[PDB]
Symmetry: D2
Subunit: 295 residues, 4 copies
């Protein structure tokens, strides 16, 4: 037998950082969960019990805290690039670092119409994520994403004209509920190293904001022919607005809400144009994916 | 042996309702999870296999949908009271109904600065709940609550002057992070029946809004001596603003964020006044509760 | 306003303890999650910011580890009683301690037909729990339980003869699937203090084993007329086998598995006597409870 | 813009099937959760709102139930292969089907030492999974796995001799606790189609059993030099025992249990050779992966 692939590191490292403006008294907090996995010339730890090649996962944990102390943690694309580069430069025999960061929302509270200097609320479990792969001699590959953005529209979704055969029971519809949890990922062109990532720093927050805005507006305004058609419209717009993105991937569940026929009870009308009360279905769910790139 | 207590019903009934304004084209959605448990002269279903006394839990499920079709589902205090009253009036041998409702957030989207007519976002997993106990001859008892409101302040929390003995290692502090998930319950005076609940309908949404506002402002503005002292201030204010509330109960975890001593690494300073990077602790957590009533 | 009730402490304290037999080399592990909440003369911490009355929750955490180091952690009824008694005896102004323990399964592995000396498997998420309330001058109240015991029988469950009215759509059946997650609690007679709890130590593990065995055998062998009737049979037997138990409470979900009519597809027969493929329903679910005591 | 990749289908389809032996009266149940995603000539549903190419996800759901009615559902490798093949053969424009199956445990109850004919228990949340990719003209690729197998050993694990530098605080140890949740995947050689999969049917259950047995015995008996070294030993043995497997992948968290220094309290000794009480850590955790193939 032979080791074909190996990676190891530390997962689920929770990190909080506070920034304190001495002039204004305003504080800003960041909270993330970080995973770092390393690859390199480490096969002998598996095959020969040679621990000399192992940077202990506990040390990886320490390094994450030290790096957060000495560097900006925002935008997460930058922090992830700094963290991954550290490992490949510091250790001769480590040749790739894989950094995943999940950013948790701490949104500044408004009290009496004014932003509070040091109080925050978790407004939703929506996350902003990055995956950064730093590979020696091959640069820095970054995939940015938003996830856990849960939306619903109560009309202006249709689904008709699909294939009908002996396995089909679904009725065509011209008015249904559409609800989903949005997972959207944009993949940046390869960067040559940290200097290049640093050169593009302002684009990271701006592109996240654009991706979010395009997703929300398109969902709200499209008279949707299907999840497929609506998601493609979102991806097309993101690619148009940021030239440094190579591909956009969406993964969308179709979280079904079923009509409830109540006509058995005193002829109560609750279907079609008379539908008011629906039964949300926990499972199963449609799952629709697409990756959109440039012509 | 004898049956000392019994209750049965349907849990986890998901319900969605849409309201459509024909004049303006605006749609408003409500989504809840409902549990209804019944009590009454039902012992023989347990002791003698006498199913004749059982209103099937499937029928309870149907009744929830029918009731939602025929009645307002907001405020949830009213809907719960209507639903519970139905069971005790309809069935001679059912003498109490226990209705629990969890309301899920569907907040209207703003697109380009204007409220969208039929698109919604789940902004946080904060819930608004009710527990309604309808008991034949004893009226309607309602407990309203908010839960899952997650907040953090990065300074203006202290904890010193506590008991110190041979079990104590905790250092006194004059500046710490305070973070919690708020669970707050206000218990209404007993209502004589549905007519009385109907008479107070506007107070339900207004009191929820007050409870939320008081919680947020007090958390943000109190220079907190302890979770205990801050929570008492919240409860006192709610009781002052709504005379029809008898008690307010808070249950607050203290979600700890620990300093990380990095001085072992190149004398890096990250404690006390120099603390910037902290380690959020998933467990254990303090848990602090109090019920506040009137003198 | 006045403080009507207050309790505070530490939740989610994970504890592991190992016992090592020096003679045989056999090791035995215990893992639990512990919560301890205290009550007493502590109102002033809430009303006056008087922390002098607060035993810090961090100190409660330390005490749990110290107590586990110095005492047996099994049976959990005993450990909980020792832990609660400590707080009311040590602190003059603390008058009640509420201890909740969840015991996690670590079952000794069999390798090649022989029990391994120091390797364990988590065989299911079934838990054994205790709630111990130690109240100064009022003794020790213990509720023992098992939870998370998930079972299914594929036949020998019926449900017919229930109330039928205009809200009823459920068909009577003489053969259905029955599946549930068992939550069973037995409440001991009040104990005067630790000496009395110590006197009954062997009864705790034996009664847990009896409760589990009675639950499994009754579920498997009863030709069930309803969840109600089957659960009552379980409770009756437990009360018969242990005189020191005052009440037994069961709380059982009815986790539905629905028939799927496939007759629309080539007249395929999959209902009634021909039912082979079913759709498990995640929600809603029936919920049936009963508390059984002595005549 | 252009569609670079697309797949869509139905996720979270829960399925139960019962087999009834008429001769013996013995019943056997199977429960799974199934996901099926399709690929093919479907770009126009995204780009042109052309639904004519869409096999509705609802129809995919129906097909799963129909297929389960007409075919064995065990071993899951076979069922997944039948299900995937159906889609590529039935629909001209569908060229790949991706089937994921999670099998849930329903283990026959022993009552009074004898196997019960129709009663089952969920003994642990361990799963047996398959991923089957059926690609037109390219055969059938199957990855089989077990997951959620949670184990702990209380001694006979070591970790010393790792890299030490200025980021290192971890002490070397010759005796620690090792606990993990095992995720193990074996990838079969490509099969030419269903006939070939059918030819190897007995190997599927036997290889799963071997993988499980090798994992448990190796974990229990290895005096482990590291997670890396122990996992490699497991993989090597599986590859030796089944020639039709090409690679074995393990992904193992290192779920840490920390010593608790209690010496501050009356010089209590609870570290090193005196360690009895430990603190399980929920996070962070090491994460160690390896893929082992043939020389
Ligand atoms: O088994 C281990 N492998 C590792 O890579 C490691 N790093 N810290 N502790 C560890 N234990
Ligand atoms: O066992 C049952 N008990 C009930 O109360 C019930 N209601 N619907 N189905 C049921 N099954
Ligand atoms: O606010 C607090 N209240 C308490 O009771 C406590 N105990 N430890 N830290 C604490 N913080
Ligand atoms: O938007 C949809 N896309 C689909 O592929 C589908 N299949 N069923 N319903 C559906 N809705
Ligand atoms: Na390197
Ligand atoms: Na009545
Ligand atoms: Na006392
Ligand atoms: Na095809």
């Amino acid at each position: 037998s032979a080791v074909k692939a190996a990676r190891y590191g530390k997962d689920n490292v929770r990190v909080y950082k506070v920034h304190k403006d001495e002039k204004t008294g305003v504080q800003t907090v960041y909270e993330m969960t970080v995973c770092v996995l390393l690859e390199g010339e480490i096969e002998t730890s598996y095959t020969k019990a040679d621990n000399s090649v192992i940077v202990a996962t506990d040390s990886i944990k320490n390094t994450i805290y030290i790096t957060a102390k000495q560097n900006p943690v925002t935008p997460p694309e930058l922090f992830g690039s700094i963290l991954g580069t550290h490992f490949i430069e510091k250790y001769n025999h480590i040749h790739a670092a894989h950094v995943n960061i999940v950013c948790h929302r701490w949104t500044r509270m408004d009290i009496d119409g004014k932003p509070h200097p040091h109080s925050f609320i978790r407004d939703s479990e929506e996350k902003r994520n990055v995956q950064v792969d730093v590979v020696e001699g091959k640069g820095i590959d970054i995939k940015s994403s938003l996830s856990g953005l849960t939306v619903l529209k109560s009309t202006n979704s249709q689904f008709w004209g699909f294939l009908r055969d002996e396995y089909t029971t679904l009725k065509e519809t011209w008015d249904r509920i559409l609800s989903t949890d949005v997972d959207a990922t944009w993949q940046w062109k390869n960067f040559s190293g940290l200097q290049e990532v640093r050169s593009h720093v302002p684009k990271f927050d701006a592109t996240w904001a654009t991706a979010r805005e395009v997703t929300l507006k398109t969902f709200a305004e499209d008279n949707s022919a299907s999840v497929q058609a609506t998601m493609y419209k979102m991806a097309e717009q993101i690619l148009a607005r940021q030239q440094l993105i190579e591909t956009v991937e969406y993964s969308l569940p179709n979280k079904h809400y079923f009509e409830i026929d109540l006509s058995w009870h005193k002829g109560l009308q609750n279907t079609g144009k008379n539908a008011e009360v629906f039964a949300p279905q926990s499972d199963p769910n449609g799952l629709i994916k697409c990756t959109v790139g440039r012509s």
